[PDB]
Design a protein around this ligand. Sequence first.
Ligand SMILES: *C[C@@](*)(O)[C@H](Cc1ccccc1)NC(=O)[C@@H]1CCCN1C(=O)[C@H](C)NC(=O)OCc1ccccc1
Ligand SMILES: [Ca+2]
Ligand code: NA
Length: 274
Amino acid sequence: AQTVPYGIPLIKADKVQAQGYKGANVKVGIIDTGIASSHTDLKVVGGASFVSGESYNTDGNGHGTHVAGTVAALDNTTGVLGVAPNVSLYAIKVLNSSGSGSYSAIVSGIEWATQNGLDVINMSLGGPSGSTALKQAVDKAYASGIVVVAAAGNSGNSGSQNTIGYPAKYDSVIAVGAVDSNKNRASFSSVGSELEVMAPGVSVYSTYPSNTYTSLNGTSMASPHVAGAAALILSKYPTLSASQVRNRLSSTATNLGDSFYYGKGLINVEAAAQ
Ligand SMILES: *C[C@@](*)(O)[C@H](Cc1ccccc1)NC(=O)[C@@H]1CCCN1C(=O)[C@H](C)NC(=O)OCc1ccccc1
Ligand SMILES: [Ca+2]
Ligand code: NA
């Protein structure tokens, strides 16, 4: 039987799916450690690998497969349910199975999504420093009309210090922080003025290689709820621009507190999709 992880109802994605909008026709690229296509609850339609020796439809780390199941685990009678179960899912492998990737892999993975006309890209990954080439790649994806979403970082706060990673810190990228099921900001969620919205990131149950399920914590788990919310919005209003989708999610978020800590708050896809 299918389990619905708490994040789905928490962001009101169930209400939008009940209206019949489930992300069909929206191409979502998961830029991560790959996706285990072998998983019975996921359907990967394409992708690219920028990690030598590894193809994109395998995942020996598990992070990309977990992130993929939060956006798009199929709605059937098994496993879990994604935020946008009918999206066309692309595996863009830029990190190897030990979780290490180069700036150049990451830039090529973003450029690949831009050249291939994807609608939304999720980057549950980041580093303490960015690069010109990384900045030019995200700005070109957003300017081309792609909704670019990234995990803010799992560095917590350190006084006044902004701990948002790159690429989340770039203005063309939505930086997503993590809350638990009670709407508390997770202790590990990164903070800073670029923090834009919050989503479930604590004990998020989703798909895991090769064909299992597991609970993980991270802003990596939050980010996919926001990329899936963007796909639900585009399945309902297909011709909206990236900045219209982005403003609907932050403008309708439920305010949770100080924006250095919660950005505009917890996304509410029912309100955002009105
Ligand atoms: C699992 C998840 O919660 C985190 C999200 C995150 C972590 C750090 C900073 C921002 C966001 N994602 C990861 O831990 C992923 C999955 C395995 C390894 N990984 C990374 O993000 C690694 C730590 N980073 C990566 O190699 O970044 C390389 C990079 C170079 C240049 C610019 C950006 C990133
Ligand atoms: Ca399922
Ligand atoms: Na940003």
